[PDB]
Design an enzyme around this catalytic site. Structure first.
Site, PDB file in Angstrom:
ATOM      1  N   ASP A  75     -11.111  -5.600  -2.564  1.00  0.00           N
ATOM      2  CA  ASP A  75     -10.379  -4.855  -1.547  1.00  0.00           C
ATOM      3  C   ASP A  75     -11.165  -3.584  -1.262  1.00  0.00           C
ATOM      4  O   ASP A  75     -11.335  -2.753  -2.157  1.00  0.00           O
ATOM      5  CB  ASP A  75      -8.961  -4.543  -2.042  1.00  0.00           C
ATOM      6  CG  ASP A  75      -8.133  -3.739  -1.042  1.00  0.00           C
ATOM      7  OD1 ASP A  75      -8.690  -3.201  -0.060  1.00  0.00           O
ATOM      8  OD2 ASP A  75      -6.904  -3.658  -1.244  1.00  0.00           O
TER       9      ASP A  75
ATOM     10  N   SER B 288       0.800  -1.221   0.000  1.00  0.00           N
ATOM     11  CA  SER B 288       0.000   0.000   0.000  1.00  0.00           C
ATOM     12  C   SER B 288       0.836   1.276   0.000  1.00  0.00           C
ATOM     13  O   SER B 288       1.573   1.526  -0.960  1.00  0.00           O
ATOM     14  CB  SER B 288      -0.945  -0.009   1.206  1.00  0.00           C
ATOM     15  OG  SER B 288      -2.032   0.871   0.994  1.00  0.00           O
TER      16      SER B 288
ATOM     17  N   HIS C 223      -7.307  -6.085   2.044  1.00  0.00           N
ATOM     18  CA  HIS C 223      -6.280  -5.110   1.689  1.00  0.00           C
ATOM     19  C   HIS C 223      -4.857  -5.593   1.991  1.00  0.00           C
ATOM     20  O   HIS C 223      -3.903  -5.025   1.449  1.00  0.00           O
ATOM     21  CB  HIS C 223      -6.563  -3.786   2.419  1.00  0.00           C
ATOM     22  CG  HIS C 223      -5.685  -2.648   1.996  1.00  0.00           C
ATOM     23  ND1 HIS C 223      -5.561  -2.245   0.681  1.00  0.00           N
ATOM     24  CD2 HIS C 223      -4.871  -1.834   2.715  1.00  0.00           C
ATOM     25  CE1 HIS C 223      -4.719  -1.227   0.611  1.00  0.00           C
ATOM     26  NE2 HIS C 223      -4.289  -0.958   1.830  1.00  0.00           N
TER      27      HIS C 223
END
Length: 268
Positions: free
Chosen positions: A215, A93, A244
């Site tokens: 997600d 991320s 995620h």
């Protein structure tokens, strides 16, 4: 030193170095099921981003880390300190987006980026679907300081797409709640307000985009948006996973995908 501040760990050996950058709410221990598959073939460098519960709260600069490039500059300083060059950077991320910005400043330091669940912006516009309306994000943060624990625990099963008895969920909550709350709130507000869309065209290092097919933080179309707007080569692999943090919650599917993108460079 830089190394002690970020708990830098170096494992393995080899001609090429793989750098592993954990995401929000975790630390370098998140990579524990991946590292054994790399160490005979690569030098592996692991580090904790500043603000992780394993780092010293007194080193957290609230001004520095209210913008993503504070993390990018830390990464550059880490790679310079250990004279790492042309690395294979694997990030989750925000970590992968911090490396992307770092790679604009310093393309020489990165051979490629392997990005697990990246997004350049969560908040919708008229012509960009990031997954969240502006005012629903505003509500989710309204009194974030007073509701951090409540909001984090209530959202964690949805974010990770696994339940409170799951091994993955108990590990995530351990590290999430070892963060100092005001630190976590600062980082959270910074992430939720990011807009890296203007920078994607300036990224030239090859990018491997790995995402869950479901997600809550990353619509599947965001992967394609990244592929279209990045300045260099890229590839997108949507996995049959949910959540995620698929590297933590679904490693059996995810670790082989990550290894393939570490090992295989993008073709024509």
């Amino acid at each position: 030193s830089i190394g002690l501040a970020h708990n830098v760990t170096i494992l393995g050996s080899g001609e090429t170095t793989v750098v592993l950058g954990h995401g929000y709410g975790t630390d370098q221990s998140v990579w524990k099921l991946l590292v054994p598959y790399l160490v005979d073939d690569y030098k592996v460098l692991l580090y904790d981003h500043m603000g992780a519960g394993t780092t010293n709260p007194d080193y957290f600069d609230f001004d520095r880390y209210s913008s993503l490039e504070g993390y990018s500059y830390d990464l550059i300083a880490i790679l310079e300190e250990f004279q790492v060059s042309k690395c294979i950077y694997v990030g989750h991320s925000m970590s992968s987006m911090a490396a992307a910005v770092a790679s604009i400043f310093r393309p020489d330091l990165f051979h490629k980026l392997v990005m697990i669940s990246p997004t350049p912006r969560l908040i919708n516009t008229e012509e960009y679907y990031g997954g969240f309306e502006q005012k629903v994000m505003d509500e989710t943060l309204r009194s974030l300081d007073e509701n951090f624990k409540s909001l984090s625990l209530g959202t964690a099963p949805l974010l990770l797409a696994c339940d409170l008895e799951s091994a993955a969920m108990q590990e995530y909550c351990r590290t999430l709640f070892n963060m100092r709350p005001d630190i976590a709130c600062c980082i959270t507000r910074m992430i939720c307000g990011l807009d890296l869309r203007p920078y994607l065209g300036h990224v030239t290092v090859p990018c491997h985009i790995i995402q869950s097919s479901n997600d809550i933080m990353v619509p599947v179309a965001v992967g394609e948006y990244l592929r279209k707007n990045l300045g260099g080569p890229s590839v997108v692999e949507v996995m049959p996973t949910e959540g995620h943090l698929p590297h933590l919650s679904m490693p059996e599917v995810t670790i082989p995908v990550v290894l393939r993108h570490i090992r295989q460079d993008i073709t024509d």
